[PDB]
């Protein structure tokens, strides 16, 4: 049934993947309300649909800046993947469009905030709490991977908590369709798999490594590999030597030694039984996988939200205008967008 479900998601994905959406809205249809996030690449803007009054989180990318960084395909991957996928734990793309200066992607607004904020405020999550979130990622990776999609940017910063306390995975900037092996060094330093660091070429297994870093960070309150200098973090990652906190359960530790495995002949997710080695693992004994997928389980944490368009679960950033030049920029580079 997981087979027959996945055989079907695949059918649906391939149909949308073949013919993509283009210019399904325009900037003047939205009111800008507030900056929700910035990062190494563009930002995110709470916006209000002038007519419907609906709120959305609009991602904005400056074409010139993408071009300078040589991020062009990453931007085309992100858009093309987002319009074709469909899963309960993936933030949905509603509209996309471009203008003279920018690319725009309008997603559903998730008002609960980043897991990073909550994790840092509480300190760490209890194992059943961390387990609830991990189960959603496990199922999301299973879904993405069955389509030959890799995600490549797992981290608390990128997981949004919805009104039910379920996870919405958000930023697909590094996501890519890989049938063979790929080579771009990207991600987030703490979360990079050894094979990315050392340019060995790599596919699905890097996400499962990152899942191990995530779980470890949820249960402990800090990631397994850390240091003064980034080069030092990489050295630890590549040694793959990891210390567990005295409060980690034995089953948790057993799972994390199988995920944080430098040797690919031993990494969970990459072996003969695939993702089932993780689902059937004991830290997950008490997980009802169908129930999680149906969002029938009860969230360990519900965000406090007042009215729609409330932004109290998000940090406050310097507000900068969306500048739209009278000259069209890099029009050819982004013709497919």
């Amino acid at each position: 049934s997981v087979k027959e479900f996945l055989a079907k998601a695949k059918e649906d994905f391939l149909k949308k993947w073949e013919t993509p959406s283009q210019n399904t809205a325009q900037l003047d249809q939205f009111d800008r309300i507030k900056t929700l996030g910035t990062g190494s690449f563009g930002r995110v803007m709470l916006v209000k649909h002038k007519e419907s009054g609906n709120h959305y989180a609009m991602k904005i990318l400056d074409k010139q800046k993408v071009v300078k960084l040589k991020q062009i395909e990453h931007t085309l991957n992100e858009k093309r993947i987002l319009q074709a996928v469909n899963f309960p734990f993936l933030v949905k793309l509603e509209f996309s469009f471009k203008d003279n200066s920018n690319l725009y992607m309008v997603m559903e607004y998730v008002a609960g905030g980043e897991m990073f904020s909550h994790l840092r405020r509480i300190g760490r999550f209890s194992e059943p709490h961390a387990r609830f979130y991990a189960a959603q990622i496990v199922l999301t990776f299973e879904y993405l991977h069955s389509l030959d999609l890799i995600y490549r940017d797992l981290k608390p910063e990128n997981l949004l908590i919805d009104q039910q306390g379920y996870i919405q995975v958000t930023d697909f900037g590094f996501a890519k369709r890989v049938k063979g092996r790929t080579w771009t060094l990207c991600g987030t330093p703490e979360y990079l798999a050894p094979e990315i660091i050392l340019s060995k070429g790599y596919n699905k297994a890097v996400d499962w490594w990152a899942l191990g870093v995530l779980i470890y960070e949820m249960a402990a309150g800090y990631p397994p590999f850390f240091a003064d200098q980034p080069i030092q973090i990489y050295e630890k990652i590549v040694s793959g030597k990891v210390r567990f906190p005295s409060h980690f359960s034995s089953d948790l530790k057993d799972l994390l030694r199988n995920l944080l495995q430098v040797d690919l002949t031993k990494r969970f997710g990459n072996l003969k039984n695939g993702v089932n080695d993780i689902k059937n693992h004991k830290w997950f004994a008490t997980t009802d996988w169908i129930a999680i997928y149906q969002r029938k389980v009860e969230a360990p944490f519900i965000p406090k939200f007042k009215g729609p368009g409330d932004t109290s679960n998000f940090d406050d950033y310097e507000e900068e205008e969306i500048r739209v030049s009278i000259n069209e920029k890099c029009g050819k580079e982004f013709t497919e967008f």
Binding site: R181, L185, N203
Partner: protein, 270 residues
């Protein structure tokens, strides 16, 4: 603490793998090699990648008082000192201070070989000197091009193997990811008759001689041996020895089954 600072994403320039030789004395090349041996990015490189990397490092001469690099000035370059003295200087609030110095040796900027990294210090020559430089784009390409080459094909070694002919593409790549390499000198015993059959071997270069308690096989580039380890866990029937300097691919059979299941299973398909 500052646990509330987000971890920023990093990303190098795209390069899809599917010439530069800067001459240097033998001694310069030895010292350069020795300076890079414990650096994360170099230390695991095989001899051929290392050699191309050293080939590609360019000469930078500096005059006394010259700024080799400037603080906040883009990190696309790694540098190793060939000769000269240098001062290290950082400006922090605030205040500019000399934080240290190099004396005819040292290296800096290795993080730049991964992704853009503005330098945290200004380095100034306090005598005439010289350095070896290396770009990030140049380095990446060498590493990625070479690995893509060692794959696609490494298999085609793998796919010429009778026992493995029914492997699907993705399964073959899983084996390519992890297959190890071993080097032997003339007359070393690669396999001993009567020993545990732990793995099979493919000759990459050189010549291996198979003998039995009596020469029964000679193995050249692209040929496998010890392959019975895949279908039976009986002791080795034959010994194997390197003729000349030999380089072999080596695959452990346990690791193989962890990835793929029993080989006979793959051989009883269609």
């Amino acid at each position: 603490i500052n646990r509330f600072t987000r971890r920023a994403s990093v990303c190098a320039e795209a390069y899809n793998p599917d010439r530069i030789i800067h001459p240097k004395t033998d001694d310069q090349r030895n010292r350069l090699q020795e300076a890079c041996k414990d650096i994360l990015l170099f230390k695991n490189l095989d001899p051929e990648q290392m050699s191309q990397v050293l080939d590609a490092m360019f000469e930078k001469l500096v005059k006394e008082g010259e700024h080799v690099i400037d603080q906040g000035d883009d990190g696309d370059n790694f540098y190793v000192i060939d000769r000269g003295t240098f001062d290290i200087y950082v400006k922090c609030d605030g205040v500019g201070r000399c934080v240290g110095n190099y004396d005819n040796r040292g290296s800096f900027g290795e993080l730049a070989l991964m992704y853009n990294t503005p330098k945290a210090a200004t380095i100034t020559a306090t005598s005439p000197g010289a350095l070896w430089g290396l770009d990030r784009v140049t380095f990446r390409r060498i590493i990625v091009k070479n690995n893509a080459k060692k794959r696609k094909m490494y298999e085609s070694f793998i796919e010429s193997l009778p026992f493995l002919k029914s492997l699907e593409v993705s399964e073959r790549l899983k084996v390519v990811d992890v297959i190890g390499t071993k080097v032997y000198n003339d007359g070393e015993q690669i396999i001993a008759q009567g020993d545990l059959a732990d793995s099979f071997f493919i000759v990459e270069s050189g010549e291996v001689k198979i003998t039995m308690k009596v020469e029964i096989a000679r193995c050249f580039r692209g040929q496998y041996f010890g392959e019975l380890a895949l279908v039976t866990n009986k002791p080795r029937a034959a010994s194997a020895h390197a003729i000349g300097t030999v380089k072999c691919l080596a695959m452990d059979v346990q690791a193989f089954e962890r990835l793929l299941g029993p080989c006979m299973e793959i051989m009883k398909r269609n």
